[PDB]
């Protein structure tokens, strides 16, 4: 629930950084801010990798979900940590941005939905078992 | 196969970022 709002917040931020508006495609504030900031740091320290993140996926509305699912399953196959979670959001951001660049606007809301569902079913259990998001804020804020 | 390389990359980067934030925590 607030997981959905987390996802929309980060994606808005990343979209806004490239001149796009979320609106065109559709405490807890300490968690958002920290995530925004971690994602920025991620994208900065690995700017090269990130300049061409999703190019080689050849995203289409038909293949989108399967590309997304394959990447996220591999990313977490052998475990979760906070940095991998950050990679996850940053990945989602790159994916949205590319969609719009490529004029596949429809994908943005879907991607948001996929991340929200993945977060709820696959990550939140680890998150609770590991302190909740308030821990994230402590370590990465 | 291009999805493997990406997530391998994603995994490598995130694990490193996470490493650093652990060194800081000490």
UniProtKB/Swiss-Prot annotation, chain A:
Effect recorded for residue 93 to E: No heterodimerization with BAX
Gene Ontology terms describing biological process: apoptotic mitochondrial changes; apoptotic process in bone marrow cell; cellular response to alkaloid; cellular response to amino acid stimulus; cellular response to gamma radiation; defense response to virus; dendritic cell apoptotic process; dendritic cell proliferation
Top-rank taxon: Eukaryota
Keywords from the UniProt entry: Apoptosis, Cytoplasm, Cytoplasmic vesicle, Cytoskeleton, Endocytosis, Membrane, Mitochondrion, Mitochondrion inner membrane, Mitochondrion outer membrane, Nucleus, Phosphoprotein, Synapse, Transmembrane, Transmembrane helix, Ubl conjugation
Motif, BH4: chain positions: 2-22
Post-translational modification: Proteolytically cleaved by caspases during apoptosis. The cleaved protein, lacking the BH4 motif, has pro-apoptotic activity.
Motif (BH2): 125-140
Mutagenesis or variant effect for residue 101 to A: No effect on caspase-1 cleavage
Keyword Phosphoprotein found: yes
Keyword Phosphoprotein in record: yes
A GO MF term: BH3 domain binding
Assigned GO CC terms: Bcl-2 family protein complex; centrosome; cytoplasm; cytosol; endoplasmic reticulum; mitochondrial inner membrane; mitochondrial matrix; mitochondrial outer membrane
Family to which this protein belongs: Belongs to the Bcl-2 family.
Self-association state and partner proteins as the record states: Homodimer. Interacts with BCL2L11. Interacts with BAD. Interacts with PGAM5. Interacts with HEBP2. Interacts with p53/TP53 and BBC3; interaction with BBC3 disrupts the interaction with p53/TP53. Interacts with ATP5F1A and ATP5F1B; the interactions mediate the association of isoform Bcl-X(L) with the mitochondrial membrane ATP synthase F(1)F(0) ATP synthase. Interacts with VDAC1. Interacts with BCL2L11 (via BH3). Interacts with RNF183. Interacts with GIMAP3/IAN4 and GIMAP5/IAN5.
Comment field on protein domains: The BH4 motif is required for anti-apoptotic activity. The BH1 and BH2 motifs are required for both heterodimerization with other Bcl-2 family members and for repression of cell death. The loop between motifs BH4 and BH3 is required for the interaction with NLRP1.
Name of the molecule in the record: Bcl-2-like protein 1
Organism: Homo sapiens (Human)
Lineage, uppermost ranks: Eukaryota, Metazoa, Chordata, Craniata, Vertebrata
Swiss-Prot record, chain B:
Cysteine disulfide partners in this protein: none
Tissue: Expressed in a wide variety of tissues. Isoform Psi is found in glial tumors. Isoform Alpha is expressed in spleen, breast, ovary, testis, colon and brain, and at low levels in skin and lung. Isoform Sigma is expressed in spleen, breast, ovary, testis, lung, colon, brain and at low levels in skin.
Name the UniProt record assigns to this protein: Apoptosis regulator BAX
Quaternary assembly: Homodimer. Forms higher oligomers under stress conditions. Forms heterooligomers with BAK. Interacts with BCL2L11. Interaction with BCL2L11 promotes BAX oligomerization and association with mitochondrial membranes, with subsequent release of cytochrome c. Forms heterodimers with BCL2, BCL2L1 isoform Bcl-X(L), BCL2L2, MCL1 and A1. Interacts with SH3GLB1. Interacts with humanin; forms fibers with humanin which results in BAX conformational changes and sequestering of BAX into the fibers, preventing BAX activation. Interacts with SFN and YWHAZ; the interaction occurs in the cytoplasm.
Similarity section: Belongs to the Bcl-2 family.
Description of its domains: Intact BH3 motif is required by BIK, BID, BAK, BAD and BAX for their pro-apoptotic activity and for their interaction with anti-apoptotic members of the Bcl-2 family.
Ranges spanned by the short sequence motif BH3, renumbered to the chain: 6-20
Maturation and modification: Ubiquitinated in the absence of XRCC6/Ku70. Ubiquitination promotes protein degradation.
Residues represented out of the complete protein: 54 to 79 of 192
UniProt function note: Plays a role in the mitochondrial apoptotic process. Under normal conditions, BAX is largely cytosolic via constant retrotranslocation from mitochondria to the cytosol mediated by BCL2L1/Bcl-xL, which avoids accumulation of toxic BAX levels at the mitochondrial outer membrane (MOM). Under stress conditions, undergoes a conformation change that causes translocation to the mitochondrion membrane, leading to the release of cytochrome c that then triggers apoptosis. Promotes activation of CASP3, and thereby apoptosis.
Organism, scientific name: Homo sapiens (Human)
């Amino acid at each position: 629930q607030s997981n959905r709002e987390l996802v929309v917040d980060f994606l808005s931020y990343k979209l806004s950084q490239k001149g796009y508006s979320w609106s065109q495609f559709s405490e807890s504030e300490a968690v958002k801010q920290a995530l925004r900031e971690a994602g920025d740091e991620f994208e900065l320290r690995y700017r090269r990798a990130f300049s061409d993140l999703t190019s080689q996926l050849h995203i289409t509305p038909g293949t989108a979900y399967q590309s997304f699912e394959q990447v996220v399953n591999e990313l977490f196959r052998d475990g979760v940590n906070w940095g991998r979670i950050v990679a996850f959001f940053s990945f989602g951001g790159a994916l949205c941005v590319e969609s719009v660049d490529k004029e596949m606007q429809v994908l943005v809301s879907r991607i948001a939905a996929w991340m929200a569902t993945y977060l709820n079913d696959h990550l939140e259990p680890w998150i609770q078992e590991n302190g909740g998001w308030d821990t994230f804020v402590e370590l990465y804020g | 196969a291009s999805t493997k390389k990406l997530s391998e990359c994603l995994k490598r980067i995130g694990d490193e970022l996470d490493s650093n934030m652990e060194l800081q925590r000490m």
